[model samples]
Target: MTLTFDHSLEAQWTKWKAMHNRLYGMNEEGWRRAVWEKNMKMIELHNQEYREGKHSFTMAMNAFGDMTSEEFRQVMNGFQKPRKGKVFQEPLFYEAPRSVDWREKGYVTPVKNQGQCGSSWAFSATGALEGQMFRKTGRLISLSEQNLVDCSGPQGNEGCNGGYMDYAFQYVQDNGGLDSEESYPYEATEESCKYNPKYSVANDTGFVDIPKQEKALMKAVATVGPISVAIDAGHESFLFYKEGIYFEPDCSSEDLDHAVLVVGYGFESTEDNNKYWLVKNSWGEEWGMGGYVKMAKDRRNHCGIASLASYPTV
Candidate 1:
């Protein structure tokens, strides 16, 4: 007996597998084909919505096409519950730019890959630290996320399992800051805490939480450097976001899960007048917007972005 299928879907699936170097046995390949086809429906529906002007953003059958949403979520996200406790923005008297991108402005490090380990909290912490270190010293240095992933266990961090950025920052503050990535490097998995104060590069005086409001977050991002933040990444569409202004209607405002860095924010001059937060994720350089996701801004704290927004102080 032979199975029936559309040549278009099958051909595209085959090409996608080759692109991502997906390999499987005959039985496993059939199961993977089923999952990929199921995911294709969502991707195609989202693109159609993008074409029809229903959504500002579009989805793609990216590397996660072979995996379920449950698998994607478990592997990609880091940052758990609010285990601890602000720099509430006092109105800035000086005028700031309408748009600010730390990446273009040389305040951010290169995009990094967190791999299968759910250690995004460490990346978020390191980015914020790097931002502040640049602001104070005018030197850009890539810090070690691995340092936090391994050494922050004493501060209630669970390494690759999960962790909070606040805890990461606290660990850095107590450990006398982080080492340069060149010295410490990233292993992407939980290793023994091999922290050495002798190799520490940039130490922070402390860290502060931006007040729990979108406006306050904007004020902080505009004046302050890149900020470490957490948000609700429960939806699968979020993982597949490719480009443009991202918004998920069903995304909760309080169910924050994933930690990312907010490097900038801006309003679109064309197409629907959507404002977006220029987010930098630790997923890798190949992901959305070059390891970044410009999420819809000013939608009443969409996805709980401002709920736990914070940054390191040099």
Candidate 2:
């Protein structure tokens, strides 16, 4: 039997499918019903949360609307073990401005979608490399995350399965440099390595880990380029985050599971003038604020933003 919806919910279903660019076949009635039910639940939860006025952030039905929490976690969260061999020193502390944005500074690349691949680590590594290269050359070039996904296996990156940004950085540095995205475009799936050094664009000398403190993270972001970071992205609120400064009281730093980029740091006045870290996500422009999230900045190192931060040196 074909599942049907009320007029109000039918409009919402159409709107949601269009918003997320989802297409369904006429024969896939069962799948459509399952997806529709999940979407309705998401909408209901979002409305309930907003009515309660408890969370600082809002929720929206995005590409992940039809996914279970486990499915979302499996596809999106992919940070593996942290690199241990690289010895990094604490960056010297410096006075930082009240607000700083790497995008405004012309060091950030456009928002990228990792699709259904568990390759956030590759995007996070390439993001930091792109920022550092732009800071040095005054030209922004999109590097190939797919290159690392395929070729960095020697450095311990398992492509879509899982990996670490630090290891990816080391792989790029040791292998001369990385190719541009145009030369080695993203395929979002595991494939044989086709990396060619002839098309390489940028190289890093090494990388440094920021001290595991909020103040130190501020200094690194203010002075250096965007830093690659790992955080726990297993919660529902994080998966459906839409706007405002996000702060989950139960968010922990102990189990850092997903990799992302810290593009800038500053304060948002809308959320009672709370300090925030402007982070770039790999889930595409449809997620968060134009493919970014403003996480609550606090001394407690919420979500491990300050715990596993590091950046490449050009």
Candidate 3:
């Protein structure tokens, strides 16, 4: 019997297939090989929930074949509901000015965030320093996250699994902070934090616990200095994504995997348009205005998901 469904599933799948092929060319065997490898690894890692399901019909489909790279890509870029209805306010402290002069303050060149490693804390700290140093000397520098990850003593971290920004701050305080990326570059593999004897220790670079008063913290940082914070970067489906109408994940529970820097904030468009925070990402300049992303300023009110926020310098 010809399998039929209420939705025009085949046609939709066809469009998805064409788009995928155009982006990442792969034959049926290649698709099966790639997907099966990912599936097995997923199962091994206990990420089976990300897979389809195990049932008679689904099993038969799997036996016949799995999704193509295009199908997988389509699934990865699914749609998401934008934050609406709820009222948002700017952080009481940092009232992001109408405009920021990167040159005068020393924030000229941009820094790249190395993904694959759970180095949000490292990136956030170095990123703020890079901006600060720029504000001081007008020189763009790439600092080290390797020094923090390897040297900072805290066995609680998962490396890539997850980590807290405060721990990184403590690491900096104890070790006197990190070195420039020029001295120690990045590698995806885990290593020890080799302290640079020459680098001066950065004091006053400690963690602040503002669990309830995030708004107060943001306001303070905006008026005071460059701050590092973690956001639900789950809406990052577009990272290294090539083409086609991709959908966002239905549940972004696991989306908070990355961390970034909140340099400055401002009102781009009026209420008719959306207000956003000019966040600097370490994902390099290839993506989103040279590694910069605009987040919803309204949603960031009271520090909802932007849980941990801090700045460098004593």
Candidate 4:
């Protein structure tokens, strides 16, 4: 029994674990390996569709490689669905620039992870604040997501559970400013609000909600800096999305659950005829294109990218 079969799937699992820094208990290694193998098959089949022009993005194994699709969906539901009492008028249509990327303009910080905590909301909020703060002072600093998670509970944030970026902005406006991640490190869990005003580095005077239209979002990303938005991230393909212009045909414009930051938008190329929104995910640098997902843009609000969009004023 000590001599386990050297199956191909087991070898691949070993390689994957090394790449993602994963480990399973001896008692559960076999089961987890089986799950990884099953997911590998799904990824292969999905990539075949990519080769057939069915999917714009190709699937690949990542940190969630060993997770079943249902398990992946459960983990992806990190955003709290907003209250139904929200509505806004549309913004006057403005032709956005041909392309816009805030990252290259020196607004975006290095991608960060939310661990097992459903604190994508905090990441999204901080991302917007950090970007707007950079736009104002031309200084880029990683604001504190941990500060929002533990302290903004009174503003309807549930720490690791879920919350909205606008509420987080309000918390900062009321609390004077947000601390730096250097002082308030992310614990990935709700802790005592160790928020001291001394460490407050970024202050969001207020936040504005963009209209619920993809065109409006395009205008905002082009004119504003990085902006926060929620999207439907329950798809298996979305969980394992590697690189390319991600176009999930079956994706809905409703039931948005994951909060992400849209740092830029552009056409894949003039000849390619594929357009995308450069979105930043908090799932770490191991996911997607170094912690970013390019969602289909102007494709009828795919994944609800424009549904719950907002940006903070620094």
Stretches of candidate 1 off by over 4 Å are 1-6, 9-12, 76-86, 89-95, 270-273
TM-score of each: 0.91, 0.90, 0.60, 0.91
Those runs of model 4 whose alpha carbons end farther than 4 Å from true positions after fitting are 1-6, 68-74, 78-94, 271-273
In model 3, which runs have C-alpha deviations exceeding 4 angstroms? Answer: 1-29, 32-96, 101-104, 132-141, 199-205, 209-218, 236-255, 271-273, 300-305
List per-prediction Cα lDDT, in the order shown. 0.83, 0.83, 0.49, 0.84
lDDT per residue as tens, model 4, 141-232:
99899999999988888887788898899899889989999999999888999999998999977788887888888888888889899999
lDDT string, candidate 2, 1-314, tens digits:
54554546666667877877777677764566567666667656766887798667887777886665666666765443454534555455557878889999899999999988889999899999999999899999999999999999998888888788888889988898899999999999989999898999999888887777888888888888798998888777788788888887778886877899998888767433488999999999988999999998974898889888888888
Query: Mind sharing the TM-score for model 4?
Result: 0.91
**Model 3 misses residue 211 by how many Å?**
5.8
Better of 3 and 4 by TM-score: 4
Backbone clash pairs for candidate 1 read: none
Q: Look at candidate 1 and tell me the lDDT of residue 150.
A: 86
lDDT of 4: 0.84
Question: How many clashes does each candidate structure show, in the order listed?
Answer: 0, 0, 18, 0
